[PDB]
Symmetry: C2
Subunit: 502 residues, 2 copies
């Protein structure tokens, strides 16, 4: 006849200022000192048991690679298998738990992050991942808190004669969540979202984000997350993927990272398709970005937007570099402003100097990669380094912000590189096509133009060149439920025959 | 600032009565006679070009397998590849077309089907697929019409400092739609839904549903669907799958059919993963049903529900036979009522006799399968045929509705695919019903539907928890019988100029 309901109003988390004299600035400073010198030991967590293995690993500070910030271990097949079994034992009760109940866990956690644990979380992202205040704040705080509150909201709204009804069921089995280095929030969401939906998760956090990943983990457990819903199981990547794609109980993989790696996981699952009790759901986020500038663009905006986009977090928010496309008529003006501003950019230790724009790159393997695209860069006939190009790793993995002009339109870094292509003004329409036919798995893109019709046009053309598309600014859960309709009849059935048959 | 959301209000299509004297009954009768004797030639359609190939095929009437209802051909790789390239050429314009525009096409089509073309469509499903009036009507009409209207509705209701906005883009490439035999509507939706979302489709319709599949196709084209948005390309299954999983331009497969076949398509795509410009989206619907009866159940309801569910469309709405679970205390009463009612069931030609409950099974390969299964069943020590078991294919692929009791909860044949009018019964001790519920849950691999019959409200709540993963559709005291096609682009446009690279804190 009539039902009660409850839904959920939520607001975006505020990005704090952190200005001199601010409560948040002092909180963070105290947070950072409480981390200086110290190093945390982080076990694998299966259920409520903290587990250590022979295979020990260290997370070091990127801008001070002599500082080991975390000691942790990799889980072995034995331990991963134990974690899987433990999770499955917990799954049916978890799934049956009303979503409001499960949402409340993620809401408490969001609130913990929002205030009391914000400094610790920001501090652990700065120190362990080399992020500046503003970068840690928009990721580990803002984004992550918002994921938690908004996911909770979508999940609760979802569950909001002859009587029909829908039931949103977790997937039957376990979800493997596999986090990337460059975001704290993404890791939290990779494990958090499937869990919210009544799933149990094996979470393999990124080795270069262990300290903060584990902070997020503990916060969720302190917020009420039962044991065995999310297993915290750092591990070797190949070992982990091999193990979980081999389990008959795999029902999903929630992945962020490279296209090759994903393809590989996909092929693994396909190879073992006959062993799974259910078809596994594979979610993978995998790339590129460009700034396309039209002759009408506002140069000041273009320059700051392009610098922020190219170099923030040392260009590690995107796999490749930022490709800049500048019309010839504006190039002289922009090249000057870029070079001027570039030399004003301060790269250093983000904990000590808040004036640091960006710090060191994430690790040694990463530093190596960047150096090779700097040696064998300063060679290529089509490339002239206009700025930067240096990099020293005696104290930390420090790379100078580098700017490069190319004369060749079609020439995976993860470093602070800005590539520039100067195009003739008359050939801008053909250059837009070049951007579209140049991007394989495009992440973001921006168009800069004061002409409204150039924008409308660029948007049509670049429709498949970026999943996030910005106009005059810098370019920077249903999968986990399975619906069951339940229809119910209240009157009896009558004859099996139909009228018309008589 | 203003916001303007457009909303589409739509109602469920009415299932017509078809009673003596009704306008719809006469319309259908005239429709059927206009089909008697005739046989339609159905080419492949790429763009607006009707194409024939050497490889010619015939669709026959199941209840009169001497009557060829349709002549059609299979597309070759050369034709499939031509269709693919043609579709891609049309895709960007189609995707850019406002969804309201694209929705209107599917709404006109729904309306065409709803009235003026309803009889033709019902008639071609009856005659080509062996469905009775009521079966054709709930499928080829009601459900297909509703897909069209409701999808249109959801698509339109989707597209409803700085300024944010979302854009729902079709997938970049072509979608392969692969239809099953047992539904006209499902075929329509497999091709129709991706299309609505700005996609171009290669549609491989089921060979045993060609006549009606093509009717639906032609209706859509008459409703305004541009050329090369959906290519009508009947083909050999292996050939088609091989060809489309080999295309760098594959962006999706929309499949309904068996788990093996799907797994196979999936493995094919995985194998060619490095060649695709985009990760293809694979949608597959793949199984089992059961009727679980509790001691409190209303026997009359159980009996008519179970008959309808077991035998309508000759059990072809479901790969596996219906498995009735009956408590010992009620079995005597239910066995009797089932046997009584069973013998009253008329199996025949659905076009001449509207008193036919169900007609012949879909085809010869299908008939064969059922003849073997029944033979495997019979012999077997744990199976007693209580009724039916006969089947004659001299005039059509006719199988008698068969009822079987098993003494083994885990009877193997019962796991094998039948697709025929078989009702398997398992009598369980009343005291052991909780354990029997567990048996149903631990017996279903890929469950399609399931029903619980019980007048006890707490047994129902309980059965619902336990059988939570045993059925995607679950019925209480009745018989147990698009987002994927869009990738969202977010578009932030900032109106104030930007400022310096530095930050406040810095």
């Amino acid at each position: 006849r009539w039902k009660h309901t409850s839904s959920l109003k939520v607001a975006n988390e505020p990005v704090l200022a952190f200005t001199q004299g601010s409560p948040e600035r002092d909180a963070l400073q105290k947070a950072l000192k409480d981390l200086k010198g110290r190093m945390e030991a982080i076990p694998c967590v299966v259920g409520d048991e903290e587990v250590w293995t022979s295979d020990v690993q260290y997370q070091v500070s990127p801008f001070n690679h002599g500082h080991k910030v975390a000691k942790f271990c990799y889980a072995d097949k034995s331990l991963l298998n134990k974690a899987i079994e433990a999770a499955l034992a917990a799954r049916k009760e978890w799934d049956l738990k009303p979503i409001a109940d499960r949402a409340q866990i993620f809401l408490k956690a969001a609130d913990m992050l929002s205030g009391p644990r914000r400094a610790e979380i920001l501090a652990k992202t700065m120190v362990g991942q080399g992020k500046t205040v503003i970068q840690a704040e928009i990721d580990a705080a803002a984004e992550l808190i918002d994921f938690f509150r908004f996911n909770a909201k979508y999940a609760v709204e979802l569950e909001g004669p002859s009587t029909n009804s829908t039931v949103y069921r977790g997937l039957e089995g376990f979800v493997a969540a596999i986090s990337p280095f460059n975001f704290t929030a993404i890791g939290g969401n990779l494990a958090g979202a499937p869990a919210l939906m009544g799933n149990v998760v094996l979470w393999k956090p990124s080795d270069t984000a262990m300290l903060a990943s584990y902070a997020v983990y503990r916060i969720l457990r302190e917020a009420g997350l039962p044991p065995n819903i999310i297993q915290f199981v750092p591990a070797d990547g190949p070992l982990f993927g091999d193990t979980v794609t081999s389990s008959e109980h795999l029902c999903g993989i929630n992945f962020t990272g490279s296209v090759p790696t994903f393809k590989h996981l996909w092929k693994q699952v396909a190879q073992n398709l006959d062993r799974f009790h259910t078809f596994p759901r594979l979610a993978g986020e995998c790339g590129k970005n460009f700034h396309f500038v039209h002759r009408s663009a506002d140069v000041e905006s273009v320059v700051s937007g392009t610098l922020r986009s190219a170099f923030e977090y040392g260009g590690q928010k995107c796999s490749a570099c930022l490709r800049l496309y500048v019309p010839h008529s504006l190039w002289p003006q922009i090249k000057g402003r870029l070079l001027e501003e570039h030399s004003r950019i301060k790269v250093g230790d983000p904990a000590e100097d808040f004036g640091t724009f960006f710090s060191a790159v994430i690790d040694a393997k990463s530093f190596a990669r960047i150096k090779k695209w700097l040696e064998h860069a300063r060679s290529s006939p089509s490339l002239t380094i206009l700025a930067g190009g240096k990099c020293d790793d005696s104290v930390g993995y420090f790379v100078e912000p580098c700017i490069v002009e190319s004369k060749d339109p079609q020439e995976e870094i993860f470093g602070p590189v800005l590539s520039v292509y100067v195009y003739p003004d008359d050939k801008y329409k053909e250059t837009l096509q070049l951007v579209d036919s140049t991007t394989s798995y495009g992440l973001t893109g921006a168009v800069f133009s004061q002409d409204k019709d150039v924008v409308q046009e660029a948007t049509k053309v670049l429709r498949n060149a970026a999943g996030n598309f910005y106009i005059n600014d810098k370019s920077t859960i249903l999968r986990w439920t399975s619906p069951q309709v339940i229809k119910e009849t209240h009157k009896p059935l009558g004859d099996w025959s139909y009228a018309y048959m008589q």
